[PDB]
Design a protein around this ligand. Structure first.
Ligand SMILES: Nc1ncnc2c1ncn2[C@@H]1O[C@H](COP(=O)(O)OP(=O)(O)O)[C@@H](O)[C@H]1O
Ligand SMILES: Nc1ncnc2c1ncn2[C@@H]1O[C@H](COP(=O)(O)OP(=O)(O)O)[C@@H](O)[C@H]1O
Ligand SMILES: [Zn+2]
Lengths: 242, 602, 96
């Protein structure tokens, strides 16, 4: 039942969940009662089980359910028993770029946004590797400012990652990949919502920069260090005896 | 995350303290001078300091342990350089060690739950199989590419070699001369035979260990252990086993000849207060048998005995037996059995037996062969278990002749030899002996000959330097005296409390005297004076000419009883830590031997 | 237990109720009744030990019941045993 609920709640990755666990139960039951249905490794035995249980209740969905040789076999058997940017004009899918975005373990909402961007504005293109590259980079720089604000060892590792995920030794093209999308995507309300959420504004806060730029000297350029820093740095030399 | 836990752990290293003194910090600082690369730990000490590691090390230990190892190595690396900057390249992982006392759970109450967790327990040991080795770091070259690489392994003493770096599969040779390894062994266990069902044979279990948690143990040593109920490989099934992560032994169960010899310093001063008292001898006589009555003269020999005597060697090899040999002789009652029960307690590393050998006990070396490879090994011996010790016997009467012979040889040279088919032995006994008698129907032997107990009329008056008729003839009041001496033992503890207040005064308890004995047994360098020479040559010729007549009257004398008091006198002076001797105790010498000649008459 | 133990000399009723296998005789029943309970051991501060537990030895002609009540006691005790010598024995009365 644990494994049943596991594989059944593996579909997302009201009446649905209930009726589907009941379905898989009595389905597996019917399939194992008689002596007719054998040599079926339990390795895989809760999948077109789940697909036909989708087919049964009320509404069914061909996509995102089967997601192979024996998949067809067992189906019939049960059903009877009952570089990257020089490349010109490439093509992509939903899950291709879900992969290239989920490699950073970023959320799926940002990915859906880049997907919407694409399927509306993937029309007039030369190469979508550039656009989606720049997109997910300017997702990373905006959401990952904290860890980077304290760890400048990150910005080399990250750019190195996407330099070789798309197979180049030259990188200034990637720099352009970022600034051009930033020129493009600059002013949409959803981009706006993300900037108020994760608070980069060029990577710097609002309540600081406005005094940086309106015309002030109270502007806190933190050359000096904060108090808790020293409060914890002192422990390193406390035990200096050893 | 994991580094949060690493810091929660590493703060416990140098930021823990109790009784206002750092504990583990300087423990490591010492261990590294020892060049030990390990430690000791309690886990009781971690519960109050922090609860962020306990509840997760419990149920996911292996997930957490090598972290601690690496944290430890991290602390090491700073302190290594800092101490090199202080005074005066290759620093591997340090085995961690720990222990606990929270509880003990038996093998019987296990199940297939709480598996891979950590459990506490009791049991008894068998195995000492072999030092089986494993790897830790081993270099690899390809045979075609000549493409060097390297591998290191961590805990499991998961993966194998690389299947491909054309060279094909298996392209790799393992180099040894620049490779590294470690040792383990396969250690068994089985429960308390006293806490078992009436019926069935017992159940045992294997386990494994590593570098410095090795070779701690030898069988029979009851031990408690804590470990991880791990697994390796009917229908479909895997073998249950355990991984050690904590061992604790009784400090020294069955008496180890490889004992302690470097005593502490605080004890020397009271030792030498007791060296310099004049009451030494009299205290020891007041205290060796505090719940025991009379026979002062008998208790006055044991102290001559336990301290041994003149280990004297000469350039041929004809040593003299550094110790002395003794024989009680007498009836029921008269404490002949109780002292012998006692003496093992006061004893550091000596042994007790009955006669004929005891159950599964060779009274001498009962050699046999190996369960594996069918090879020869010297097994046992009640006369060699106790090398450098006393031996206690009761029922000397019913020997076997083969059993009697070698023991009959020990008490004059203390070296057994066995030369059966293939093995040729000279195994050193080097022991002292306490006997005990069975007079036939008791008392009428004084009316009769010296002997007329058993058919060794020879060895009695020959191989013995202390032989005593041990009885009083039912004096109507000695009975009451000994009875009221002893009745208070059983309740009221007045006989015990008297020893309490007299140890508060001038007496000594069991172990202080034990250590005194051990120390002087191995320390002293005695000798006797030329001046004391003639004193007993005169006694000897006189006792000779004396009993010449009275034994020529148709009623023994040996060079050995001559040579015996030579060494008893040195013992009683030894008590005062005497590199020389005078008549002060030579008078007591014949004062005490005269009992033997009086018995010699009758 | 305490109610009856303290009330007027149980022990006649002990030997009345020890082992009704045979009508037999009261004296050796009494001896082994002492053998049942065990006494108390002590040591004078961990030396001069005393044995608290009790021993027995019976003998006589085989015509009377000698191998009965001991097996009864095996049935009646806690952590008793019926071992034997060679033949019809649980174990050989040693360790090995
Ligand atoms: N000289 C003695 N003084 C006091 N108690 C004794 C003496 N001799 C024996 N006992 C006591 O009587 C009991 C019998 O032991 P013991 O006489 O040593 O064995 P055995 O009678 O077989 O030689 C022991 O419990 C012991 O405490
Ligand atoms: N007084 C008795 N009442 C009933 N049966 C008896 C009586 N005495 C002896 N028996 C029977 O005779 C047997 C005597 O056996 P026993 O003498 O114990 O054999 P062994 O001497 O070989 O142990 C017992 O098994 C018992 O059943
Ligand atoms: Zn290769």
């Amino acid at each position: 039942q644990h494994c049943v609920a596991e594989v059944l709640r593996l579909d997302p990755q009201s009446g649905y969940l209930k009726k589907l666990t009941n379905a898989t139960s009595i389905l597996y039951n019917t399939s194992l009662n008689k002596v007719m249905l054998k040599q079926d490794e339990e390795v895989a035995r809760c999948h077109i089980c789940a697909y036909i249980a989708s087919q049964k209740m009320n509404e069914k969905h061909m996509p995102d359910l089967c997601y192979p040789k024996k998949a067809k076999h067992l189906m019939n058997l049960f059903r009877q028993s009952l570089s990257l940017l020089v490349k010109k004009y490439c093509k992509m899918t939903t899950e291709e770029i879900i992969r290239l975005c989920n490699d950073f373990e970023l959320p799926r909402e940002v990915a859906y946004k880049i997907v919407d961007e694409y399927n509306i504005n993937a029309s007039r293109l030369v190469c979508p590797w550039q656009l989606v590259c720049g997109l997910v980079l300017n997702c990373t720089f905006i959401v990952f400012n904290e860890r980077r604000r304290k760890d400048p060892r990150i910005d080399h590792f990250i750019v190195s990652k996407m330099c070789s995920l798309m197979l180049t030794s030259k990188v200034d093209d990637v720099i352009e990949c970022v600034k051009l999308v930033k020129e493009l995507i600059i002013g949409e309300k959803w981009f706006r919502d993300l900037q108020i959420r994760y608070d980069d504004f060029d990577g710097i806060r609002y309540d600081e920069i406005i005094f940086r730029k309106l015309g002030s000297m109270l502007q806190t350029t933190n050359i000096l260090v904060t108090d808790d820093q020293y409060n914890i740095w002192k422990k390193r030399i406390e035990m200096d005896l050893a | 995350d994991n580094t949060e836990i690493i810091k929660s752990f590493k703060n416990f290293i140098l930021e823990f303290r109790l009784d206002s003194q750092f504990i583990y910090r300087d423990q490591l600082r010492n261990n590294i001078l020892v060049k030990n690369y390990s430690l000791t730990v309690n886990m009781e000490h971690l519960i109050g300091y922090n609860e962020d590691i306990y509840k997760k090390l419990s149920d996911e230990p292996s997930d957490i342990i090598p972290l601690f190892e690496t944290a430890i190595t991290q602390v090491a690396k700073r302190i290594s350089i800092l101490s090199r900057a202080q005074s005066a390249n290759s620093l591997p992982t340090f085995q961690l060690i720990l222990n606990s006392n929270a509880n003990q759970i038996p093998l019987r109450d296990l199940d297939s739950e709480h598996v891979s967790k950590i459990v506490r327990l009791s049991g008894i040991i068998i195995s000492t199989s072999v030092l089986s080795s494993r790897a830790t770091y081993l270099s690899i070259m390809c045979r075609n590419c000549r493409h060097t690489t390297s591998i290191t392994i961590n805990n499991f003493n998961t993966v194998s070699l690389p299947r491909s770096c054309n060279c094909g599969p298996d392209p790799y040779i393992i180099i040894h001369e620049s490779s590294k390894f470690i040792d383990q062994q396969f250690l068994k266990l089985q429960e308390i035979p006293e806490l078992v069902p009436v019926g069935e044979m017992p159940r045992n279990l294997t386990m494994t260990c590593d570098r410095y948690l090795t070779n701690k143990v030898i069988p029979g040593t009851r031990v408690t252990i804590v470990g991880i109920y791990s697994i390796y490989n009917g229908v479909a099934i895997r073998t249950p086993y355990i991984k050690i992560l904590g061992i604790q032994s009784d400090v020294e169960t069955s008496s180890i000849w490889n004992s302690v010899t470097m005593f502490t310093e605080e004890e020397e001063e009271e030792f030498l207060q007791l060296s310099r008292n004049p009451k030494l001898y009299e205290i020891l006589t007041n205290s060796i048998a505090p719940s025991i009555f009379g026979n002062e003269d008998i208790k006055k020999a044991i102290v001559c005995l336990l301290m041994g005597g003149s280990k004297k060697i000469l350039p041929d090899g004809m040593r003299l037996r550094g110790d002395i040999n003794v024989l009680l002789l007498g009836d029921p009652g008269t404490a002949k059995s109780q002292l012998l029960k006692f003496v093992e307690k006061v004893s550091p590393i000596a042994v007790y037996t009955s006669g004929k050998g005891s159950s599964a006990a060779g009274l001498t070396a009962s050699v046999q062969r190996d369960p594996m490879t069918r090879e020869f090994y010297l097994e046992g011996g009640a006369m060699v278990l106790a090398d450098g010790g006393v031996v206690c016997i009761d029922e000397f009467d019913k020997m076997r002749d083969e059993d009697r012979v070698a023991i009959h040889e020990a008490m004059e040279q203390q070296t057994i030899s066995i030369a059966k088919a293939g093995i040729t032995t000279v195994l050193n006994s080097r022991t002292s002996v306490l006997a005990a008698a069975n007079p036939i129907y008791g008392r009428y032997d004084d009316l009769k000959s010296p002997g007329d107990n058993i058919d060794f009329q020879t060895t009695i008056l020959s191989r013995f330097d202390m032989i005593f008729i041990v009885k009083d003839d039912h004096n109507e009041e000695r009975d009451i005296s000994i009875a009221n001496h002893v009745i208070n033992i059983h309740t009221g503890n007045a006989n015990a409390m008297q020893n309490q207040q007299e140890e508060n005064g001038s007496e000594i308890s069991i172990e202080k005297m034990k250590r005194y004995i051990t120390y002087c047994r191995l320390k002293c360098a005695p000798r006797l004076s030329p001046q004391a020479a003639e004193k007993l040559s005169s006694n000897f010729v006189t006792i000779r000419k004396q009993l010449l007549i009275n034994e020529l009257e148709s009623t023994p004398i040996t060079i050995r009883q001559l040579e015996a008091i030579i060494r008893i006198t040195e013992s009683l002076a030894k008590l005062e830590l005497s590199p020389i001797a005078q008549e002060r105790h030579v008078d007591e010498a014949i004062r005490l031997f005269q009992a033997s000649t009086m018995d010699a008459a009758s | 237990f305490r109610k009856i133990s303290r009330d007027r000399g149980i022990i006649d009723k002990i030997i009345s109720s020890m082992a009704p296998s045979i009508y037999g005789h009261r004296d050796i029943k009494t001896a082994v009744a002492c053998s049942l309970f065990g006494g108390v051991p002590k040591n004078v501060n961990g030396k001069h030990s005393i044995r608290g537990d009790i021993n027995v030895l019976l003998l006589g002609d085989p015509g009377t019941a000698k191998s009965q009540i001991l097996k009864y006691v095996e049935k009646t005790a806690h952590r008793a045993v019926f071992a034997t010598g060679q033949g019809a024995s649980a174990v050989g009365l040693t360790a090995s």
